[PDB]
Amino acid sequence: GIIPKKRQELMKWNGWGYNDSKFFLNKKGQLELTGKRYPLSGVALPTFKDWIQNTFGINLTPPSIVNEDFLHELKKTNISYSQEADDRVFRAHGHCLHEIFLLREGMFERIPDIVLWPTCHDDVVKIVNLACKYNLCIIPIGGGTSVSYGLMCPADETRTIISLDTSQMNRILWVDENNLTAHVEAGITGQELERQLKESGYCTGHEPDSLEFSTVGGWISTRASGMKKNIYGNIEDLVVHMKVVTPRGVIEKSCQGPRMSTGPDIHHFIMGSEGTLGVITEATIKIRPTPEYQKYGSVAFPNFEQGVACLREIAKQRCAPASIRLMDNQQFQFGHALKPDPNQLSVATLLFEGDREKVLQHEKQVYDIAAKFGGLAAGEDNGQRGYLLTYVIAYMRDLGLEYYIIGESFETSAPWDRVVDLCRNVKERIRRECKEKGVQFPPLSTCRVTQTYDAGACIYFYFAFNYRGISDPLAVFEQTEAAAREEILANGGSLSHHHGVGKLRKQWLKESISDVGFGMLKSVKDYVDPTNIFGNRNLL
Amino acid sequence: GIIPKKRQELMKWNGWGYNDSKFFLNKKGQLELTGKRYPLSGVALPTFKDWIQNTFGINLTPPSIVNEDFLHELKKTNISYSQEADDRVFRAHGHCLHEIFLLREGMFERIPDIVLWPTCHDDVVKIVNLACKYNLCIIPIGGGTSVSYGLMCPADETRTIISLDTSQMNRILWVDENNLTAHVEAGITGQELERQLKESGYCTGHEPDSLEFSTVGGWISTRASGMKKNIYGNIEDLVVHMKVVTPRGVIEKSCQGPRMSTGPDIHHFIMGSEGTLGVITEATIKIRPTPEYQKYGSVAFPNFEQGVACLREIAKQRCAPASIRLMDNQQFQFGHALKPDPNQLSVATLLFEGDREKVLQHEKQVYDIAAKFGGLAAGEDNGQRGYLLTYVIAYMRDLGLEYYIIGESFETSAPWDRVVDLCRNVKERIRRECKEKGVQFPPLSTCRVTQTYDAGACIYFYFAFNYRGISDPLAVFEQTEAAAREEILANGGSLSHHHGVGKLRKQWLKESISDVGFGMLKSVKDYVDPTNIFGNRNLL
Ligand SMILES: Cc1cc2nc3c(=O)[nH]c(=O)nc-3n(C[C@H](O)[C@H](O)[C@H](O)COP(=O)(O)OP(=O)(O)OC[C@H]3O[C@@H](n4cnc5c(N)ncnc54)[C@H](O)[C@@H]3O)c2cc1C
Ligand SMILES: Cc1cc2nc3c(=O)[nH]c(=O)nc-3n(C[C@H](O)[C@H](O)[C@H](O)COP(=O)(O)OP(=O)(O)OC[C@H]3O[C@@H](n4cnc5c(N)ncnc54)[C@H](O)[C@@H]3O)c2cc1C
Ligand SMILES: C[C@@H](CC(=O)NCc1ccc2[nH]c(=O)[nH]c2c1)c1c(F)cccc1F
Ligand SMILES: C[C@@H](CC(=O)NCc1ccc2[nH]c(=O)[nH]c2c1)c1c(F)cccc1F
């Protein structure tokens, strides 16, 4: 569960995930997943090949530029470091499509010059003090799962870029059973954090799809959201305290009290900072007893529209289960094609978790509400296989890439009264833009509602196309994604619910938060990091 | 429910509340409240006189300095304004003890020079533009309920001080029944907001003790907390959107989505700004159906310690009702003395509110948990009279002042494992400090736990003494309150849970949030308001 230093030894150098986990054609000509790692690993998927065919119409290094005096002082600290090509290349990207192409099919313009692996807070203080002295530039990395060009090195950056890798600064420091909090180093992965806490009968319940690699410090940096937010909260709810190293000095509140009125909350100044202000070294997170019991479920609806109305009503009654998600028809068919009126029909997956008794009180209320929108209980299996699926979806990018298929997921949050219109108009905008740019086959564009809130919902989109017969396929993707974002904003959706801005969405930020607001962010950046040491150039 | 312009016509010029509501000795020599306004209004309180005697051992204008050219432009806007003494004196204070003495028994050093009453957002833009041009200073006021010297005018402030009164900028702009949000002007009072919304079947549930006068813009400015937070949230939870006028310009997010990842959340840059960055003019707040049903309750415990352990356990199981509060023994006796082992015994009051059916499921779980800490159901009456009492407590300051008794309430939040020790040591610190400073009778110092959180609790303290026979009684109070704050911090409590900092707690802020953090606040202030127009000098 700890990420090793030489990452390529466990993980794919050119795509998502673990080296031992890849999609291949088995000795029956059926798609199957390698290894023994996930539930679907080593399980043949007879309909999955047919589905890809039917849906898409297919068959089936720069040198290191580092000062020798800085390197001399760095050796005195016994902070491990590397100037090796394959380590620096690994830490120069996340998992946006364009990055993955330049990885497979060429080279990046700029990559980090040196990688450092601090192991504690004081190490990070040393590195930042060194960067002041020798005029260095720092780009923190945890899991490297950014889908916002958050880790990309600016091409015109003349200074030595340090990739400050947090993966080895990863121990749970204390578990406070009295206050139900856990004080942890920022580099720890979700999976490792949940595994260690479970041994003591606890958990956080913070479960992003990237949890195998994404870190505590990452989550704080990007305002990450988790699958079971309904119970455990998002990251802004979960974080009681943090310790941050910046060029100006160390930020840290002097007390651990649950809720304060001591001016503007400086946690929110860091939470969402996307690596531009400093290094988040330590954080105190809320824990809960390991849930007594879990149960899955599903509900089918005549159409998407009625499903949304039901989710709305569940939100209105504040009786949403741990996870509730509504798939459109194309996604329902997708999930059916992965097992070992039926064209508009939509399905909601459910996950209830908690105390044995309360879980059932909940379950009833949800199904009764669903009844009144034409919702019919559609089985415990549908639910369960739906959630196990989520940690393998990311591997399908690489599969599609073999067979001339490209695509990416994208998201927004919007008010309840804009959901239905937004989903419909964004999908339409994708079809139109594709046709106009010369795509031969109708592009796949689907959506699901992944989170409910009082004031609205999170909407998660997939879009993909067969790019065979297109002059410049990356420009087509790039331009269509940007069109979808324009449509999202025009239909009252947000710039991002949880992926954040990074460098992918910088152009919209001033509109989103206003000019004065943008300037507030800049004023902070310029106090904390006047000479731009933390110069990934995300956000501003 | 709307605050009029000439406030003194409905409200007390020299103390808390409505003119028609005062404690007096009735024609039987019993204490009674005037008027018909509260549940206890016109109800005689036979034991209350005896209690005050037993507990305490007693028997029972500067000229307006304003530019004529600015005044000329102001007349062109038809924004109402006043230079009258009694209007300016009214808006020069909140309800800290020292302010109330200077009001009754003398004069303030500095007061506002002119009062303005804008009626909308554009009016506020005009005023702030005028303050840039003629070098004016602005101190926003809503209810004037600050207990942090938040409204006090700095004595050495040479510029013309505008009291920007929000009371007339108070209309509900829309009610969005689809998104369950209400878009409101910042000057509306809680009481008026709840009344208007109830006519459409809705509420916010945000219920501070100051709700009769405190405003939406106030609550955002001070990070206000409400009695029924457990259901409805505190202000940071309730606010979906806001519009803020600052010298640099207008801040406002371009979309109304429920949850975002677009960098640091600029709402939290304003929320807690205590009138130092700008004027909050409009805000979008979460609403809920008017709760179907309410029920009160109470539980008695052998001691305070066991009550705290029970509240902790309720928090751990996340089954706290709308309100749960634990009184120490002195406060239990107090409440008993106001009706028309018993020395350590403590009592918890309960308020359950919601859907008819779910309220009872809750009720059972609370009492069963309480059973295991020696908690015996202690009646529906105790509960009900406990909560009706909270809106009359504030009127007792003025009663005590007649009979040589002074005192103030103060608060903190602390982790669960520091609650019991903090309460005991803070009370002890108050007795010791009082004795050392020459107080005749040991003072009253009591506490109650008013809110529970995952990571800790809010603790609410009263302290008071008979000041007869003391040279300088305001210095004694001042110095003791500051000693209590020292003791709070030393026992792991926070600088404030909900009253905020203002100018009362400025000296501790840098410790509380760290020096870099303090600088982050200052960096924002300086960008947004470079010439200190918003110069109440709270916080920094
Ligand atoms: C397959 C997949 C699934 C995903 N699922 C989800 C999901 O369910 N929910 C969700 O919110 N997001 C998701 N994401 C997006 C991403 O995982 C999150 O934004 C996550 O918070 C990033 O974690 P990380 O540790 O990989 O950070 P990185 O990708 O390593 O870095 C992200 C940014 O934060 C900065 N940073 C990292 N560590 C620190 C630190 N210690 N101090 C200061 N700055 C730092 C970096 O400089 C960079 O700008 C997913 C991404 C992928 C590829
Ligand atoms: C009897 C009593 C009971 C109380 N009970 C509670 C309670 O239960 N919970 C709680 O949290 N607090 C309580 N308070 C404290 C206080 O009422 C709150 O902090 C409240 O939020 C202040 O609201 P207001 O409209 O009275 O603001 P004011 O006192 O009028 O102003 C407070 C501060 O905010 C600024 N301000 C006001 N309006 C604006 C605006 N529109 N834009 C920008 N800045 C502005 C002012 O300049 C000032 O610094 C209580 C106080 C009293 C006297
Ligand atoms: C699933 C995406 C690839 C992708 O964008 N993966 C990243 C990812 C995967 C899962 C996520 N869950 C989130 O909340 N954010 C997430 C981000 C994809 C397609 F949408 C279409 C075709 C191939 C393909 F790989
Ligand atoms: C009730 C207080 C006066 C006081 O503290 N008023 C302000 C006040 C009153 C009620 C409050 N509820 C909160 O949450 N904050 C509050 C602040 C008081 C004393 F603490 C002691 C003697 C008389 C007296 F009136």
UniProtKB/Swiss-Prot annotation, chains A, B:
Q: What is the reaction catalyzed?
A: a long chain fatty alcohol + a 1-acylglycerone 3-phosphate = a 1-O-alkylglycerone 3-phosphate + a long-chain fatty acid + H(+); hexadecan-1-ol + 1-hexadecanoylglycerone 3-phosphate = 1-O-hexadecylglycerone 3-phosphate + hexadecanoate + H(+); 1-hexadecanoylglycerone 3-phosphate + a long-chain fatty acid = a 1-acylglycerone 3-phosphate + hexadecanoate
Extract the ranges annotated as region (Important for enzyme activity): 497-499, 536-540
Sequence positions that bind substrate = R397
Concerning PROSITE patterns, the annotation shows: FAD_PCMH
Q: Record's Gene3D superfamilies?
A: 3.30.160.650, 3.30.300.330, 3.30.465.10, 3.30.70.3450, Uridine Diphospho-n-acetylenolpyruvylglucosamine Reductase, domain 2, Vanillyl-alcohol Oxidase, Chain A, domain 4
Quote the pathway field.
Answer: Glycerolipid metabolism; ether lipid biosynthesis
Q: A GO biological process this protein is involved in?
A: ether lipid biosynthetic process
Q: Which InterPro entries match?
A: Alkyl-DHAP_Synthase (IPR025650), FAD-bd_oxidored_4_C (IPR004113), FAD-bd_PCMH (IPR016166), FAD-bd_PCMH-like_sf (IPR036318), FAD-bd_PCMH_sub1 (IPR016167), FAD-bd_PCMH_sub2 (IPR016169), FAD-linked_Oxase-like_C (IPR016164), Oxid_FAD_bind_N (IPR006094)
Indicate the transmembrane segments per the record. none
Localized where? Peroxisome membrane; Peroxisome
Look up the domain of life of the source.
Eukaryota
| Notes on how activity is controlled | Inhibited by N-ethylmaleimide, p-bromophenacylbromide, 2,4- dinitrofluorobenzene and divalent cations such as such as Mn(2+), Mg(2+) and Zn(2+). Inhibition by p-bromophenacylbromide is strongly pH dependent and is highest at alkaline conditions.
Q: What Gene Ontology cellular-component terms does the record carry? A: peroxisomal membrane; peroxisome
Q: PTM N6-acetyllysine: at which residues?
A: K22, K253
Q: Which UniProt keywords apply?
A: Acetylation, FAD, Flavoprotein, Lipid biosynthesis, Lipid metabolism, Membrane, Peroxisome, Phosphoprotein, Transferase, Transit peptide
Major location category of this protein: membrane
Q: Where is this site: Important for enzyme activity?
A: R325
- Assembly behavior: Homodimer.
State the protein's purpose: Catalyzes the exchange of the acyl chain in acyl-dihydroxyacetonephosphate (acyl-DHAP) for a long chain fatty alcohol, yielding the first ether linked intermediate, i.e. alkyl-dihydroxyacetonephosphate (alkyl-DHAP), in the pathway of ether lipid biosynthesis.
Q: Which PANTHER family match?
A: ALKYLDIHYDROXYACETONEPHOSPHATE SYNTHASE, PEROXISOMAL
Protein name (database record): Alkyldihydroxyacetonephosphate synthase, peroxisomal
Q: Which species?
A: Cavia porcellus (Guinea pig)
From which lineage does this chain's organism come?
Eukaryota, Metazoa, Chordata, Craniata, Vertebrata
What is the gene called?
Answer: AGPS
